[PDB]
Amino acid sequence: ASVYAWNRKRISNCVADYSVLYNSASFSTFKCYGVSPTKLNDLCFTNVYA
Amino acid sequence: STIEEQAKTFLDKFNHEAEDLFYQSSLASWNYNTNITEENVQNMNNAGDKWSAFLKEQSTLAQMYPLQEIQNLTVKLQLQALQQNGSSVLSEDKSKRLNTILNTMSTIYSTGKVCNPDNPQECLLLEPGLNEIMANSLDYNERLWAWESWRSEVGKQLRPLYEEYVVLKNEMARANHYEDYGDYWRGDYEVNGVDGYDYSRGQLIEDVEHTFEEIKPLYEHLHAYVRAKLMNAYPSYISPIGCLPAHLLGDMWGRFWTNLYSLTVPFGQKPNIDVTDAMVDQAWDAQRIFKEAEKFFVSVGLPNMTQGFWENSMLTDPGNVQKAVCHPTAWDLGKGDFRILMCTKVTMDDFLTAHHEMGHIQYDMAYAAQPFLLRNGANEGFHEAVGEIMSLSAATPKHLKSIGLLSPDFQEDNETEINFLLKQALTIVGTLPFTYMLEKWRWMVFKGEIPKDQWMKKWWEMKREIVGVVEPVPHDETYCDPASLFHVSNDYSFIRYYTRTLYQFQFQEALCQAAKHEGPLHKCDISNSTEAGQKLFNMLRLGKSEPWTLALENVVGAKNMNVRPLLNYFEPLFTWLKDQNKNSFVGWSTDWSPYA
Amino acid sequence: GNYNYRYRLFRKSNLKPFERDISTEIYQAGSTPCNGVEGFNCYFPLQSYGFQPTNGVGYQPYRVVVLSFELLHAPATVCGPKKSTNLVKNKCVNFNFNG
Ligand SMILES: *[C@@H]1O[C@H](CO)[C@@H](O)[C@H](O)[C@H]1NC(C)=O
Ligand SMILES: *[C@@H]1O[C@H](CO)[C@@H](O)[C@H](O)[C@H]1NC(C)=O
Ligand SMILES: *[C@@H]1O[C@H](CO)[C@@H](O)[C@H](O)[C@H]1NC(C)=O
Ligand SMILES: *[C@@H]1O[C@H](CO)[C@@H](O)[C@H](O)[C@H]1NC(C)=O
Ligand SMILES: *[C@@H]1O[C@H](CO)[C@@H](O)[C@H](O)[C@H]1NC(C)=O
Numbered sequence: 167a168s169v170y171a172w173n174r175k176r177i178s179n180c181v182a183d184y185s186v187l188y189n190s191a192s193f194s195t196f197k198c199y200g201v202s203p204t205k206l207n208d209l210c211f212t213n214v215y216a
Numbered sequence: 217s218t219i220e221e222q223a224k225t226f227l228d229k230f231n232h233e234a235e236d237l238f239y240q241s242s243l244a245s246w247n248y249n250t251n252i253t254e255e256n257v258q259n260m261n262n263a264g265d266k267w268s269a270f271l272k273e274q275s276t277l278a279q280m281y282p283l284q285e286i287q288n289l290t291v292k293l294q295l296q297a298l299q300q301n302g303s304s305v306l307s308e309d310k311s312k313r314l315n316t317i318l319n320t321m322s323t324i325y326s327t328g329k330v331c332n333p334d335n336p337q338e339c340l341l342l343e344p345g346l347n348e349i350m351a352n353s354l355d356y357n358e359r360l361w362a363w364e365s366w367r368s369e370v371g372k373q374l375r376p377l378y379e380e381y382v383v384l385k386n387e388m389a390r391a392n393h394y395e396d397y398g399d400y401w402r403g404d405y406e407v408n409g410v411d412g413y414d415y416s417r418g419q420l421i422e423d424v425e426h427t428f429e430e431i432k433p434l435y436e437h438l439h440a441y442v443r444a445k446l447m448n449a450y451p452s453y454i455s456p457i458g459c460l461p462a463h464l465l466g467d468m469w470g471r472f473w474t475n476l477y478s479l480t481v482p483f484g485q486k487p488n489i490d491v492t493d494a495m496v497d498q499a500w501d502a503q504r505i506f507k508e509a510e511k512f513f514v515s516v517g518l519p520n521m522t523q524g525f526w527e528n529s530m531l532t533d534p535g536n537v538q539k540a541v542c543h544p545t546a547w548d549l550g551k552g553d554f555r556i557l558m559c560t561k562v563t564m565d566d567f568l569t570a571h572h573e574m575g576h577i578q579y580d581m582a583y584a585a586q587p588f589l590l591r592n593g594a595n596e597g598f599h600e601a602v603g604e605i606m607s608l609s610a611a612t613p614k615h616l617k618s619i620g621l622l623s624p625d626f627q628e629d630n631e632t633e634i635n636f637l638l639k640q641a642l643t644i645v646g647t648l649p650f651t652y653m654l655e656k657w658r659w660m661v662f663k664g665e666i667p668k669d670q671w672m673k674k675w676w677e678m679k680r681e682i683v684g685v686v687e688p689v690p691h692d693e694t695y696c697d698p699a700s701l702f703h704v705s706n707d708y709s710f711i712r713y714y715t716r717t718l719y720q721f722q723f724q725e726a727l728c729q730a731a732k733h734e735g736p737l738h739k740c741d742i743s744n745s746t747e748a749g750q751k752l753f754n755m756l757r758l759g760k761s762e763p764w765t766l767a768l769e770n771v772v773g774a775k776n777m778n779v780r781p782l783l784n785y786f787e788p789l790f791t792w793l794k795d796q797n798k799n800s801f802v803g804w805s806t807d808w809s810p811y812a
Numbered sequence: 813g814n815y816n817y818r819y820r821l822f823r824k825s826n827l828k829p830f831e832r833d834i835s836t837e838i839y840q841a842g843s844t845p846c847n848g849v850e851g852f853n854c855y856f857p858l859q860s861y862g863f864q865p866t867n868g869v870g871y872q873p874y875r876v877v878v879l880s881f882e883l884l885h886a887p888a889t890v891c892g893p894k895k896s897t898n899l900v901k902n903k904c905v906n907f908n909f910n911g
């Protein structure tokens with residue numbers, strides 16, 4: 167989507183494997199604010215907004 | 217709300233809609249230059265017409281915002297740059313006539329072909345047919361024939377065109393609240409609104425005369441030495457008391473004296489610093505030349521070239537099937553796209569040109585953070601000067617030894633430094649009186665000090681007085697001898713070379729003081745010095761956001777252009793020329809004593 | 813040139829966090845009313861991106877995905893993968909089965 171009309175996808179009731187994203191070489195920025203990437207694959211959240 | 221916020225939003229809209237369009241126009245010009253084909257010419261013309269019409273519409277929108285209600289210096293600078301009418305203040309018939317005159321002068325200069333009367337079956341164009349003859353021949357009457365025949369054809373075609381050109385440009389300039397077209401050209405150095413750092417259009421001519429009065433003894437000694445050597449080369453034509461004949465200066469117009477280095481060498485028996493054979497022996501490709509230049513620019517601390525530079529530049533001649541312009545040009549296409557179009561050979565000249573154009577690329581990259589209409593040099597002198605300082609630093613024997621191109625057992629004695637400094641003087645010092653005389657003559661023509669029937673009588677009088685060069689035979693008013701040069705026939709400012717030459721040595725002294733070099737200035741190399749690169753990049757990142765006086769304070773610590781770094785650079789050569797001119801007579805006579 | 817990506821260039825006030833503005837109403841920068849037409853001091857707020865493959869890295873298109881993690885008083889159901897150690901039987905081990 168365009169930045170004025172940015173797409174928001176609500177992610178619920180599944181298993182979120184963040185190590186697949188973190189260990190990818192295809193991403194230039196993976197800057198996490200408020201949490202570290204190593205404990206993302208352990209912690210649990212109510213909803214994920216993408 | 218306020219006028220300033222309205223202008224800020226308008227400038228954001230302008231930069232946004234003028235960046236993609238400038239990128240399209242620049243890409244079309246690039247596709248024309250790397251591929252000379254008729255559809256690329258049509259695409260270039262369409263993009264240029266769209267760009268000029270868009271600039272006309274944005275200037276029309278921009279004038280409705282008055283200047284005196286804006287206090288921010290950068291916003292006021294962009295509004296001042298945008299609100300210039302250009303040719304739009306002139307009537308549509310006269311604007312069309314001026315554009316037609318400029319285009320037909322471009323076609324006459326580009327497609328001008330001249331050869332000997334009674335032998336018309338084939339003829340030679342200026343580049344490279346006449347350039348090689350002017351730079352390499354040793355025959356007096358052949359060079360006289362080529363010079364007089366090319367000024368006969370070109371001047372007799374261009375004289376009514378130039379007479380219309382001066383009137384139309386003066387009309388446009390006085391319609392734009394300037395005194396003349398010379399004042400319009402001098403308005404590039406005009407700084408208004410900054411406390412202390414203000415520079416006036418009338419101060420430029422006074423500063424040029426003040427610097428040239430200190431140039432004059434060094435040029436007089438160099439002219440006496442060149443006169444003695446050309447008297448040795450041509451025994452009877454040159455007089456001991458008079459000026460130099462015009463067709464013997466090694467170039468078509470007298471722009472550079474660098475083609476007289478073979479005739480005027482001090483110590484021919486001693487070797488040269490030519491590194492061509494070493495690159496041929498080590499098989500140095502042009503890619504290796506540009507990578508060594510990039511290594512030089514990362515050694516001083518400047519940013520390295522982008523991936524798009526290496527992907528999209530043409531650093532080698534494409535072939536017979538594909539046509540390209542051979543002139544080396546660095547292109548800032550916009551949106552972070554930086555390219556070099558050069559047909560690079562394995563020579564020292566192409567290596568120094570590669571350093572010069574990559575200096576242009578570094579200068580273009582440095583002000584990429586600036587707004588679009590401020591993406592230029594602070595004046596026209598800085599943009600060329602930052603390439604010429606790289607040409608100075610790369611040409612040193614220390615740089616050649618450091619990169620391995622010169623033998624470590626090469627003996628650097630005083631004689632090689634003298635002849636290298638003389639070559640640099642023939643390139644650099646010799647263009648200064650020609651540049652000053654040409655710009656002062658054009659300023660007096662635009663100001664109306666010289667009437668149209670007296671243009672040439674004054675001009676040769678100026679050339680004898682300033683350049684010390686005499687005409688072979690007298691020329692009447694049917695000739696147009698200035699407009700045979702590329703820049704004057706195609707509406708280009710010429711004082712940029714004078715300002716570039718002085719800024720070159722000012723920047724050289726500033727960076728060598730930054731690099732803590734402890735020897736002669738011409739022995740100085742600015743590689744390996746992070747602080748010199750930082751001092752350079754502080755001025756380089758500003759672009760046109762700050763005044764050139766403040767930028768010169770940022771580099772050299774002075775508020776004005778200075779002549780002392782040039783004299784300090786050539787001081788060993790100045791003492792050597794004063795020693796060599798004991799028997800001979802320094803200075804010239806403006807009379808017709810050699811030949812007329 | 814890929815011009816299929818527009819941005820908002822002007823708005824009267826800054827956006828709130830996680831706000832989407834898809835309005836296409838003419839921005840009024842001046843005192844004069846726009847009247848719905850893009851004239852002088854009145855600009856269309858949505859402007860297109862110019863994306864060419866020969867552009868520099870500061871102008872090349874970048875796809876950005878921002879993941880927002882919030883904890884609310886409801887039971888958290890988007891959990892990470894729970895790494896499972898192979899099962900060992902017939903030995904005195906510390907077992908952790910589903911908490
Ligand atoms: C130059 O133009 C010709 C004719 O249009 C074309 O065939 C050729 O591919 C072009 N060269 C490049 C490098 O694109
Ligand atoms: C002038 O405008 C630029 C942006 O247009 C801004 O960054 C700068 O801070 C302004 N300067 C002053 C003194 O307001
Ligand atoms: C441009 O031309 C218009 C029309 O004469 C004039 O009103 C305006 O002042 C000119 N702008 C400048 C900067 O001279
Ligand atoms: C420029 O320098 C950076 C930092 O060292 C490096 O990552 C990059 O690959 C260099 N670019 C080129 C084209 O060598
Ligand atoms: C170089 O130095 C030597 C000895 O100091 C001297 O004899 C010679 O004249 C010098 N050459 C030049 C060109 O100054």
Ligand SMILES: *[C@@H]1O[C@H](CO)[C@@H](O)[C@H](O)[C@H]1NC(C)=O
Pocket residue numbers: 515618743744
């Ligand atoms: C500058 O740095 C490069 C890289 O370390 C080195 O090869 C070169 O010799 C240095 N220059 C001098 C004059 O030491």
